[PDB]
Amino acid sequence: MVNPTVFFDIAVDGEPLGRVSFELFADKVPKTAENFRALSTGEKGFGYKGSCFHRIIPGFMCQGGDFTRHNGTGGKSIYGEKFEDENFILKHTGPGILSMANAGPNTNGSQFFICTAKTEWLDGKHVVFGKVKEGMNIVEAMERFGSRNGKTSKKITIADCGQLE
Ligand SMILES: O=C1NS(=O)(=O)c2ccccc21
Ligand SMILES: O=C1NS(=O)(=O)c2ccccc21
Ligand SMILES: O=C1NS(=O)(=O)c2ccccc21
Ligand SMILES: O=C1NS(=O)(=O)c2ccccc21
Ligand SMILES: O=C1NS(=O)(=O)c2ccccc21
């Protein structure tokens, strides 16, 4: 089947910035892709809409998905529990790679990061499950609001999100 595409409409201190869309590699990592797809549509009753990118490190990555504690300490999968690292088939090859944050082997929840460079040292530790398809320039615009320690200088939020045809 055809891989799902999801979009995030990003806002900066509540002003619209632009749209970033992702291919999710359901053909390689179906469980991981389905988690992110469902959280992006809100079909389980919760997920990414209204949440923020809480950690952004320019030249490295923009990190989000903590819709429970808003700071890197929370998140929730669609599965009732944190889930396995499905496989490490896909690697951190460059800008645009969408990968799972975690707290150790087999502890995937809802946090993820969009790489803005090649991050090969994360291979085998974080599960890659998608890639920016359109709006990488918007990820680049976002990255500028990050800082050395990851704290953001403006509030970067997913104003809306869902699945495209
Ligand atoms: O691809 C899948 N990985 S899974 O075990 O979570 C699962 C459950 C049900 C249907 C499909 C799939
Ligand atoms: O239908 C599904 N129920 S499930 O969420 O466990 C799942 C996981 C992956 C792909 C499809 C499906
Ligand atoms: O909407 C929700 N229903 S839920 O209690 O499972 C939940 C848990 C955490 C964040 C949001 C939500
Ligand atoms: O070491 C890490 N733990 S984490 O999942 O928050 C994370 C996200 C991005 C890059 C590195 C790391
Ligand atoms: O320049 C780009 N335009 S894009 O949105 O297709 C994209 C995706 C991934 C890496 C780079 C780029």
Curated annotation (Swiss-Prot):
Residue numbers of N-acetylmethionine PTMs: 1
Domain spans labelled PPIase cyclophilin-type: 7-163
Any single Pfam family the record assigns to this protein: Pro_isomerase
Residue numbers carrying Phosphoserine: 77
Activity regulation as described: Binds cyclosporin A (CsA). CsA mediates some of its effects via an inhibitory action on PPIase.
Cross-link (Glycyl lysine isopeptide (Lys-Gly) (interchain with G-Cter in SUMO2)): 28, 82
UniProt keyword Disulfide bond, yes or no: no
Matches recorded under Gene3D superfamilies: Cyclophilin-like
Keyword terms, alphabetized: Acetylation, Apoptosis, Cytoplasm, Glycoprotein, Host-virus interaction, Isomerase, Isopeptide bond, Nucleus, Phosphoprotein, Rotamase, Secreted, Ubl conjugation
Residues with N-acetylvaline modification: 2
Enzyme's top EC category: isomerase
Localization per record: Cytoplasm; Secreted; Nucleus
Glycosylation sites: 108
Record annotation: effect of changing residue 69 to A: No effect on peptidyl-prolyl cis-trans isomerase activity. Reduced interaction with BSG/CD147 and ability to induce leukocyte chemotaxis
Enzyme Commission number: 5.2.1.8
Residues with the N6-acetyllysine modification: 28, 44, 76, 82, 125, 131, 133
GO biological process, one term: lipid droplet organization
Mutation effect (residue 126 to A): Loss of peptidyl-prolyl cis-trans isomerase activity and interaction with HCV NS5A. Loss of ability to stimulate MAPK/ERK phosphorylation
InterPro entries according to UniProt: Cyclophilin-like_dom_sf, Cyclophilin-type_PPIase, Cyclophilin-type_PPIase_CS, Cyclophilin-type_PPIase_dom
Protein's job: Catalyzes the cis-trans isomerization of proline imidic peptide bonds in oligopeptides. Exerts a strong chemotactic effect on leukocytes partly through activation of one of its membrane receptors BSG/CD147, initiating a signaling cascade that culminates in MAPK/ERK activation. Activates endothelial cells (ECs) in a pro-inflammatory manner by stimulating activation of NF-kappa-B and ERK, JNK and p38 MAP-kinases and by inducing expression of adhesion molecules including SELE and VCAM1. (Microbial infection) May act as a mediator between human SARS coronavirus nucleoprotein and BSG/CD147 in the process of invasion of host cells by the virus.
Assembly mode: Interacts with protein phosphatase PPP3CA/calcineurin A. Interacts with PRPF19 isoform 2 (via N-terminus). Interacts with isoform 2 of BSG/CD147. Interacts with FOXO1; the interaction promotes FOXO1 dephosphorylation, nuclear accumulation and transcriptional activity. Interacts with integrin ITGA2B:ITGB3; the interaction is ROS and peptidyl-prolyl cis-trans isomerase (PPIase) activity-dependent and is increased in the presence of thrombin. Interacts with MAP3K5. (Microbial infection) Interacts with HIV-1 capsid protein.
Family: Belongs to the cyclophilin-type PPIase family. PPIase A subfamily.
Name the UniProt record assigns to this protein: Peptidyl-prolyl cis-trans isomerase A
Gene for this chain: PPIA
